[PDB]
Design a protein around this ligand. Sequence first.
Ligand SMILES: C[S@@+](CC[C@H](N)C(=O)[O-])C[C@H]1O[C@@H](n2cnc3c(N)ncnc32)[C@H](O)[C@@H]1O
Length: 259
Amino acid sequence: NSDKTFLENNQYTDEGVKVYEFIFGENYISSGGLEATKKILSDIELNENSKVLDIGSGLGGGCMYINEKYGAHTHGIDICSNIVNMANERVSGNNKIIFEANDILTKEFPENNFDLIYSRDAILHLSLENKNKLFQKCYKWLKPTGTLLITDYCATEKENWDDEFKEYVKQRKYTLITVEEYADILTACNFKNVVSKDLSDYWNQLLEVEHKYLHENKEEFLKLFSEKKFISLDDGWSRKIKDSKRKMQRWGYFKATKN
Ligand SMILES: C[S@@+](CC[C@H](N)C(=O)[O-])C[C@H]1O[C@@H](n2cnc3c(N)ncnc32)[C@H](O)[C@@H]1O
């Protein structure tokens, strides 16, 4: 009843994680790395007394940035123990950053605890039933004055997927839904002021920067990895660029409040 072994042994092996970090940037394994993070948080207000939860915290770049910018207490949860071990090696002497290995679906936190619950491209791993269960937990865990802030991989309606896109989703065991279905889940969970944005155009821009970087730094990549891994990454980004342009694969942004 867990995907922990599946994730640790395939997509998020140590080397898999290091390949992602090469292309996304130091401390990041998701879209746009540091630059997208600055943008996503540009209108967010927190301070040194704030409490933040990062769901699917990865190598911890997001927690590092939120703590640096605001001085906030940050608690990241990630199901992959090897990734959490790597995250903890990236931070020292800071008792306001915590990284914990756990399945968010089984983790308990106090009701009315967090000023911000933040997640970047992680919830795509959860089944539709579990997305709904997670957002019910998030609603409970947010302070009355708290905010939910998410980016996640979305898609056009499943009926519209082509062969290559179906294979991509199946191989990774992603559950991708439309930006609109996702927003409706938040509304159903009683979140208020639900804002969704289809950021597929911006995502396409981020992908192009990354793809260019990969090509310009191929020699360095090959010193670290193998040509086989290069080709896989290169082809993967090419498909994401193509599919984001036509909105077959989409990038969703969601912000909501508890009250
Ligand atoms: C995009 S990657 C990490 C993203 C990270 N926020 C970043 O921007 O670099 C997705 C992460 O979600 C985590 N994840 C998947 N299912 C999870 C679950 N059920 N509970 C906690 N973390 C999970 C994976 O371990 C993985 O590190």
